[PDB]
């Protein structure tokens, strides 16, 4: 019953191909609810979940104002960072930012987040105190000094402990039938001979929400961590997720192996075997 809200910003320069693109997306847990793309024919914040549609024009206008402003500021920031790293005007570079709030099952703030990266590398992060910064390198220390000078951390703390939590709680109520519903995985084991003396057992989890899940194989009751192939959790496109874990076993030993599934949607964790 814990919940989070996150915004994810991507700003990408593209010398010779116009001004840098800014994209913002917002999520509650594993559900996206808004987007903004400065490359759109008519850039505006758009709904991406049915429960946000009820927000009034003032909401959409305020969001759009914010993201249109951010489009311009992140363009300047990309120029600034290019300078901080003595980089050529010829290369494409990316700033990413992720920020938001985490609530525990009581609805209370657990912690806030605000982190940035440059070309995929940590650049600067707001510490858990919501009051101080961790800069990755001497360029980021320049940003730290600018942000210390401008009282940015104080404003982000006020947001994170205030509006962030308030709006997240509003979304959770408006979207309660989906955001506050855990869909358990549907699970089964398949068997695929690979040779005369070995076979693959693949443990499947399908149709689950949220994305967090644990799938493990045991042999004789011992986790088979080093010998398990585990694919990345993947979206089905209907809000739910899919995952599998596989192990190659000696033929005739299949019943020594058990698949174990943990998911919020399960009252009791599951143990499965191949059923021939």
């Amino acid at each position: 019953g814990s919940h989070s809200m996150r915004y994810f910003y991507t700003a990408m320069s593209r010398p010779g191909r116009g001004e840098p693109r800014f994209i913002a997306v917002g999520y509650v847990d594993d559900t996206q609810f808004v987007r903004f793309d400065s490359d759109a024919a008519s850039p505006r914040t758009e709904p991406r979940a049915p429960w946000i549609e009820q927000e009034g024009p003032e909401y959409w206008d305020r969001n759009t104002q914010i993201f249109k402003t951010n489009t311009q500021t992140y363009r300047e920031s990309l120029r600034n960072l290019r300078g901080y790293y003595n980089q050529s005007e010829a290369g494409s570079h990316i700033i990413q930012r992720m920020y938001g709030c985490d609530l525990g099952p009581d609805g209370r703030l657990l912690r806030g987040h605000d982190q940035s990266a440059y070309d995929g590398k940590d650049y600067i992060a707001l510490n858990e105190d919501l009051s101080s910064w961790t800069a990755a390198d001497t360029a980021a220390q320049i940003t730290q000094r600018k942000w210390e000078a401008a009282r940015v951390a104080e404003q982000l703390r006020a947001y994170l402990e205030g509006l962030c939590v308030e709006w997240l709680r509003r979304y959770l109520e408006n979207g309660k039938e989906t955001l506050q519903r855990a869909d358990p995985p549907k699970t089964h084991v398949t068997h695929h001979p690979v040779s005369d003396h070995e076979a693959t057992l693949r443990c499947w989890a399908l149709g689950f929400y949220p994305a967090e899940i644990t799938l493990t194989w045991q042999r004789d009751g011992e986790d088979q961590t080093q010998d398990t192939e585990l694919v990345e959790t993947r979206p089905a496109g209907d809000r739910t997720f899919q995952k599998w874990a596989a192990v190659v076993v000696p033929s005739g030993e299949e019943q020594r192996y058990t698949c174990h599934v943990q998911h919020e949607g399960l009252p009791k964790p599951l143990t499965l075997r191949w059923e021939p």
């Binding site: 917002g26 305020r62 300047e76 940015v152 404003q155 982000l156 962030c164």
Partner: peptide, 14 residues
Amino acid sequence: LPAVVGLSPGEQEY
């Protein structure tokens, strides 16, 4: 709802 920081657009810069 997203964040709004900064003395000005300028103060939001990295």
